């Protein structure tokens, strides 16, 4: 049970993607060959809606999920730590959440009582994470998965954005395909120009009419650090 009273209008800044956002189509090794494929890809030089924090803009809104999205987040500090996918985001329709809470990675899918304002609280005094509330009940369940243990640095960094992490999500035939990729970057604006291939990392067997998506942000106490994530829709 938490909420924010102070609000700031979303920026909703539109930028351009420099022909980035491709992924491996199939699990077949091919070398020294030019292959022609037809699938859902991000169009070259297309709009990307950016959402920016640390400017008193704790956005965390709902974004439509039409034929998949391309999630590219640039951040020098771990402010974005997962997503939540659902139809109505209430406790009347099943939703799947993926949170990068430390010492594991959690994927769970169940009739979740969303708090309407996801939260992840960590104080800058000791750089230690304290418990937060993303949901209040669980009700009926249908998936679960806990990964291995790792620790991500919560220490705040004063420098500009240091790493780029891009993901691609697609729901087809009851499977949520996830592709991951990461490349170093040093800039403070727009989306780095370049090329990068995304490798398959997940195929989650959950049957949900996934139509809306919302990210999970981390706040350093009202207010947070600098982190920008871009959303791009794929088209056939």
């Amino acid at each position: 049970c938490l909420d924010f009273d102070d609000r700031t209008p979303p920026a909703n800044t539109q930028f351009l993607s420099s022909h980035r956002g491709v992924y491996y189509p199939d699990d077949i090794f091919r070398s020294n060959v030019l292959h022609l494929v037809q699938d859902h890809f991000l169009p070259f030089d297309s709009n990307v809606t950016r959402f920016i924090t640390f400017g008193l803009n704790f956005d965390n809104p709902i974004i439509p999920f039409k034929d998949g999205i391309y999630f590219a987040a640039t951040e020098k500090s771990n402010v974005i730590r997962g997503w939540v996918f659902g139809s109505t985001m209430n406790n009347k329709s099943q939703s799947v959440i993926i949170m990068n809470n430390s010492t594991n990675l959690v994927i769970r899918a169940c009739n979740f009582e969303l708090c309407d304002n996801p939260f992840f609280v960590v104080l800058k005094s000791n750089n230690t994470q304290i418990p937060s509330y993303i949901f209040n009940n669980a009700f009926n369940c249908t998936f679960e998965y806990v990964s291995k243990d790792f620790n991500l640095d919560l220490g705040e960094k004063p420098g500009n954005f240091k790493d780029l992490r891009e993901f691609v999500f697609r729901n087809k035939d009851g499977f949520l395909h996830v592709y991951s990729g990461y490349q170093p970057i040093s800039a403070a604006s727009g989306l780095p120009t370049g090329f990068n291939a995304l490798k398959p990392i997940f195929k989650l067997p959950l049957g949900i009419n996934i139509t809306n998506f919302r990210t999970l942000l981390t706040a350093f106490p009202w207010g947070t650090s600098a982190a920008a994530y871009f959303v791009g829709y794929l088209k056939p």
Binding site: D26, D27, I28, F29, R30, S31, V33, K92, S93, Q94, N111, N140, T142, D173, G174, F175, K199, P200, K203, P205, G207, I208, N209
Partner: protein, 291 residues
């Protein structure tokens, strides 16, 4: 060809055929479940002794070839329907079950099983423990679930159940012992898998052999048959790919299930030969020229 190089992964555990096909409780159609299958020796001969399937018909693969092939990404669904609704579980069908409860994809690589269970899922009085949806907006997408229980109205406005044009979308299956073949419980198990595309960890009992290299052999790598010469390679395979392909669709590189090591496959026949003859009338001797 001379020898056989059949090679299968290191699987030494029998598949769970009692957890499924012999589960104490089976879910309803409107809320079905899924189970992941891995590290199995899929021999359906063990089911010959206990379970008899009234309908075992499926697509994307031949029934007789299920013992040699190797499948990947195997999942098993389970639900309970009546006699007349057991024909709706098939690609390209219409009905209450095939629209609002469980829809199969148009293209489907898997197997569907179903048997009759009257002595277990029926009583002298009504069972009324299995439910299904009959009122819904639109149609379900293939392999999707809808477990929400909200009042349904033709207009779409939320409403209380006692109001007009407001019904509960879930009805109860009334199973009695004194019923015909129709309206009788039928437990259905649907299996889906993908083969010869990704690395696999589940298939039937085929005894692997040793590796034969630099010789025309009849290999069998995870169900992929053919004749060729196996040669050590230099390509580097990423951990999510197993086979390789050329500019023309043909497998040239296959990762060894056991002893991961990338092997090259080449055609056995290569070259050219011509025959020189002075004429049959003159002599029967010939001269052979190899290019």
């Amino acid at each position: 060809p001379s020898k056989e190089v059949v090679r299968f992964p290191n699987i030494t555990n029998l598949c769970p055929f009692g957890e499924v096909f012999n589960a104490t409780t089976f879910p309803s159609v409107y809320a079905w479940e899924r189970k992941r299958i891995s590290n199995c020796v899929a021999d359906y001969s063990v089911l010959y002794n206990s379970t008899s399937f009234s309908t075992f018909k499926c697509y994307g693969v031949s029934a007789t070839k299920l013992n040699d092939l190797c499948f990947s990404n195997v999942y098993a669904d389970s639900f309970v329907v009546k006699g007349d609704d057991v024909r709706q579980i098939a690609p390209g069908q219409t009905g209450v079950i095939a629209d609002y409860n469980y829809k199969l994809p148009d293209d489907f690589t898997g197997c569907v099983l179903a048997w009759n269970t009257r002595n277990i899922d029926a009583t002298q009085t009504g069972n009324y423990n299995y439910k299904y949806r009959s009122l819904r907006h639109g149609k379900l997408r293939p392999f999707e679930r809808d477990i929400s229980n909200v009042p349904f109205s033709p207009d779409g406005k939320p409403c209380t159940p006692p109001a007009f044009n407001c019904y509960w979308p879930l009805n109860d299956y009334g199973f009695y012992i004194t019923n015909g073949i129709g309206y009788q419980p039928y437990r259905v198990v649907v299996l889906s898998f993908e083969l010869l595309n990704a690395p696999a960890t589940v298939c039937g009992p085929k005894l692997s052999t040793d590796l034969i290299k630099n010789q025309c052999v009849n290999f069998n790598f995870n169900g992929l048959t053919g004749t060729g010469v196996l040669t050590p390679s230099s390509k580097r395979f990423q951990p999510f790919q197993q086979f390789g392909r050329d500019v023309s669709d043909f497998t040239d590189s296959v990762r060894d299930p056991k002893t991961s090591e990338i092997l090259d496959i080449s055609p056995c026949s290569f070259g050219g030969v011509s025959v020189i003859t002075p004429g049959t009338n003159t002599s029967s001797e010939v001269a052979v020229l190899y290019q």
